Structure formats: structure tokens, C-alpha cells
Design a protein around this ligand. Structure first.
Ligand SMILES: [Cl-]
Ligand SMILES: [Zn+2]
Length: 255
């Protein structure tokens, strides 16, 4: 079977349409229970939503959102708006077009051109950046020795090299927000030592979810994020300072 990869800002409450294989046309139907209708209507933009998701019809791993080509969706006979322009594949909030009643069915008509694709619908709670931050801080702090070993590595001179890096420089300020770091974080896959502010980075992806490193522009998914232990200890010792300089001998001082 096909499963979707969980979204960091969405907690699945129920599955309304299980992942189902898709100028082609396919018709879908689903119903909400009175309890599910009550959850939506009392969630104030609603915080409990109906989420439509598309992906590749692949089984080896949980799938990320992937729109089929020439996608055009109709929810309850009404044209469903998609992300602007190539078009980025993302979950679709169909709550504004949903029939928020237990007494009537909801209809989805999908048009695309032919690889196989899959469609699924979920009842979700949209989480805040604050909640996602607390979930991140709950995974703990990365060993400060992991950064110390990375610093040592980068300052280890290549023997068949003329120009050798004798010292590294990092900032204690966020490269995105310009204020001093509170939660210094980075993706595990990033090669650089420069961290960015975790709270600010989640505040940004709450609105527009690009999950892109503000330092190197590589992918920085939520599930790859760590809190640098070394920068956590420095942020506690250091005071009137912007940039730190690291030596080979392990020492550090202002830059
Ligand atoms: Cl660790
Ligand atoms: Zn990066």
C-alpha cells in the first residue's frame, strides 16, 4: 500500500479517503461525522481542516506531496484553487469548499494527464510554530562534541594544499532575523557550522513552507533539524559579541 509522509504543521485526526490510485478524470466521495463537523466549526480560517493530498503511486517509502501533470481539482462542483507558478506540490486545504454537514456527501472530481498517481483526504489540526518549536526543543540538544569534531575536521590542513584554513568564523546572530540566536539550529545535512534561529525559521515555514536553509539554500526539512550543543554553551558564556573565531587548538574568541 501507499502512505503519505507526515506534514510538520499537521496532525492527522482521521482519514476521510484512504490513499487511492488515480485528459484523465476520476470521481471521489466522502462524508463527515457530526463530531468531525463540530470539531471543524468550533475551530475558529479553521484550525481543524479537510486536507486533500496527492503523491506518486509508490510503496517503498512514505510519500511526499506530488501533483500529477495538468492537475485541475473540483470540490463539490466548485473549482479548487492550487498553488501558483512549474507548480509546487503541496497539501490542499479544501475546508472552504467542503460541505460542513453530516447529512450530505462531499464530492471531488480530479483531472490530470498520464506513471500512476495517488489521492488521499484527511481531517487534520493545523499546529502553530510555537507548538512545533516546543516539539523540536523536546527532541533535545545535539552533543557539543559533534560540532567540536566538525571544527577540528575543517581546520585539519590537507597535506597536498597550499592555502590552509587556520581559523573558522561563525556569527551568534541569526542570518535570517539579524537578532542574537535563542535556539541555534541547523539541518543534519548542512555542511556549514553557521546556525539559524529555530523559532524564527518555524515562524517563516508556518506561513510559506519551503523548508530551505537561510544559510546555504539546501533543503532543511523539519525532521532533519538539530539544536547545536556547542552554540548553546557559547550563547550562555559570551555577551557583547556578534562573531566568534575558532582555532585548531580548540580555543575560541571574538572575531
Ligand atoms: Cl547527539
Ligand atoms: Zn544549510
Amino acid at each position: 500500500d501507499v502512505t503519505m509522509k507526515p506534514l510538520p504543521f499537521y496532525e492527522v485526526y482521521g482519514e476521510l479517503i484512504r490513499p487511492t490510485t488515480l485528459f484523465e478524470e476520476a470521481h471521489f466521495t466522502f462524508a463527515l461525522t457530526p463530531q468531525q463537523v463540530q470539531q471543524i466549526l468550533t475551530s475558529r480560517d479553521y484550525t481543524i481542516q479537510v486536507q486533500l493530498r496527492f503523491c506518486l503511486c509508490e510503496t517503498s517509502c512514505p510519500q511526499e506531496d506530488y501533483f500529477p501533470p495538468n492537475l485541475f481539482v473540483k470540490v463539490n462542483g466548485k473549482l479548487c484553487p492550487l498553488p501558483g507558478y512549474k507548480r509546487p506540490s503541496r497539501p490542499i486545504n479544501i475546508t472552504p469548499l467542503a460541505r460542513l454537514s453530516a447529512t450530505v456527501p462531499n464530492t471531488i472530481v480530479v483531472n490530470w494527464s498520464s506513471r500512476n498517481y495517488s489521492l488521499s483526504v484527511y481531517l487534520v489540526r493545523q499546529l502553530t510554530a510555537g507548538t512545533l518549536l516546543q516539539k523540536l526543543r523536546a527532541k533535545g540538544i545535539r552533543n557539543p562534541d559533534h560540532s567540536r569534531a566538525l571544527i577540528k575536521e575543517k581546520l585539519t590542513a590537507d597535506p597536498d594544499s597550499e592555502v590552509a584554513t587556520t581559523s573558522l568564523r561563525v556569527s551568534l546572530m541569526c542570518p535570517l532575523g539579524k537578532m542574537r540566536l535563542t535556539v541555534p539550529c541547523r539541518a543534519l545535512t548542512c555542511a556549514h557550522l553557521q546556525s539559524f534561529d529555530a523559532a524564527l525559521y518555524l515562524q517563516m515555514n508556518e506561513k510559506k513552507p519551503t523548508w530551505t536553509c537561510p544559510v546555504c539554500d539546501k533543503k532543511a526539512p523539519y525532521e532533519s533539524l538539530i539544536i547545536d550543543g556547542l552554540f548553546m554553551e557559547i550563547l550562555s558564556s559570551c555577551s557583547d559579541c556578534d562573531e566568534i573565531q575558532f582555532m585548531e587548538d580548540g580555543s575560541w574568541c571574538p572575531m
